[PDB]
Amino acid sequence: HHHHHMGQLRLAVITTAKYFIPRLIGPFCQRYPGINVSLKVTNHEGLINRINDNLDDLYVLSRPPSGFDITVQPFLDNPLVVVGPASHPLANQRGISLERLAQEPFILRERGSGTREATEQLFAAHNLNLNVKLDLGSNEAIKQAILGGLGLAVLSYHTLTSAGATPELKMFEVEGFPIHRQWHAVYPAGKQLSTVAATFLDYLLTESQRIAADIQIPES
Amino acid sequence: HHHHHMGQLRLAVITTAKYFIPRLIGPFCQRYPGINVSLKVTNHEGLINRINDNLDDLYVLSRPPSGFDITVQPFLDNPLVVVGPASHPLANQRGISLERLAQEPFILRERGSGTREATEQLFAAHNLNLNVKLDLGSNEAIKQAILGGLGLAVLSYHTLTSAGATPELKMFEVEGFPIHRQWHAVYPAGKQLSTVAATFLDYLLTESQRIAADIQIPES
């Protein structure tokens, strides 16, 4: 091992993408051991500020931002799904109706959050009331709250793929889910990508569908 | 239908406490269904602001803050430890020196993090240069990077697992580790705790000493 790294890769990704980006960083760093990587993980507001200040090589976001000279490339599905404990009575039920589901307590992200609005918007179309027991601003906090028995959640499928994930939390088979959403690679269009970043972007675009199969992203 | 405990409970905790606090709310609410609980998860600057504005009943942080009239209750040790993959050559080695550890690449959190600054200060105290090859802003990313073979990390004990996931990490026996850090519940001392807050605090102390007993080892 060497102390000085002839090249650097600066990434900033939306919080939920923390479960997926390291699956690329790992094999990339094994191929190019002379690179040091910096990875920032933050919400949409944080990422916009970093783009505004031009801090990183590459950004991973859900929705492409307005007001910036950027190139945007979709690369991966981010489906939102119903999550609960494996011990829940509905855990193994097939085709759970949205009515049987609405009578369940939920732990969701804050109002105005992407996942929260999707389930609220969906619950509006069937004129049903969503029973919100607790509002948490963190994927990890929500999953901890589920295993404490406080109810079910709507989370991105990628929160189920933590390293060493166990069958203790599981995706529920529910009508109207998964709700399709996408992740995009974003970078400033005014300046050319560095060689390291361009090499990583190509890897991300060519390698992500292999990983999508290995973690079994639902195409639903 | 006789609930002796009804009230409002407002909690605010430092980010790392998302790994132990939200899972406790579940059984607490199952025991006291008449208590309405809100939980805010934020960083140190955010938490300090909330204490200043008197927004919550109880606050969970590591080091007690300066400049506030507060009562402080210790409740859980969350020590910092060296972790690597089980297949690493050092995995089963006894009494690894910091010199020996310093030849390895490290995967750490960003600057300003508790784990990063503790590790930088310790290695500086032995005039050792820490090879931080990957600076990753997420424990989940760090754990994947470890399992990918990219090197070693420093994490707090309760971050070594996550809700529904037990990655195959191994704690290394290393001189200068574990670095003890104590977590505290704090509340303004000018006002008596509300009945519900005192009930939650008593619960938090009882369940944390349960966790402490479960991992107890001989100390000096």
Ligand SMILES: O=C(COP(=O)(O)O)[C@H](O)[C@H](O)COP(=O)(O)O
């Ligand atoms: O911004 C967040 C949101 O929390 P969450 O990931 O729980 O949605 C976290 O700081 C990073 O994601 C890293 O979290 P971690 O160190 O736990 O991986």
